[PDB]
Amino acid sequence: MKKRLTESQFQEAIQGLEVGQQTIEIARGVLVDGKPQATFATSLGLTRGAVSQAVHRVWAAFEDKNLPEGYARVTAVLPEHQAYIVRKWEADAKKKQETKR
Amino acid sequence: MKKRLTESQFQEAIQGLEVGQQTIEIARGVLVDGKPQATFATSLGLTRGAVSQAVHRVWAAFEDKNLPEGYARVTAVLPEHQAYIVRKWEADAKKKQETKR
């Protein structure tokens, strides 16, 4: 879980998002109140990836006006032949930041 | 030139679509009726990229089941330093599927 903040700043974040009310209402308790994401997924009956996306989308919007998550995921037009190596490169760039020896 | 979609095939696509009815209604007249997307953009006050996003959103669900696009996009975790070269690789794959000299 990340930090939480007030609805005033929450409004600033969701004003940069054209998303469904579901995403906004999750964030309203998750990163405004500071409620656990695991239980939030079970209560609403949403998927884990959907709940985590609501946290990420809204929080990153506020972060975009301050300092965002420094994680880069490159998406480009490339054939499936390139995807062979892309599978490996996904974990390999992670390994570049990781110090697991 | 693409194709139109009857309401039966439309229901097949939009059932696997997690989008607001606003985006669905775009494709309801754009794809179902096979109508120009630029006119609908001006009618709803939407951007051209937003309208075509709704076209592709519903169409991609049908594409995944039937026959997808010719342009593939790979997603890999990689830093922006690598993206310097990935930008040229993206243009190369686009030039692989488009015969230009």
Curated annotation (Swiss-Prot), chains A, B:
Among the GO molecular function terms of this UniProt record, one is: DNA binding
Q: Does the keyword Heme apply?
A: no
UniProt DNA-binding residue ranges: 37-56
> Gene3D superfamilies annotated for this entry?
1.10.10.2690
Keywords of the record, alphabetical order, are: DNA-binding, Plasmid, Repressor, Transcription, Transcription regulation
InterPro entries for the chain:
Fimbrial_Adhesin_Reg, TrfB
Name a Pfam family for this protein: KORA
Q: What does this protein do?
A: In conjunction with KorB, inhibits the transcription of kilA, trfA and korAB operons. In conjunction with KorC is responsible for the negative control of kilC and kilE operons.
Q: What is this protein called?
A: TrfB transcriptional repressor protein
Organism of origin is: Escherichia coli
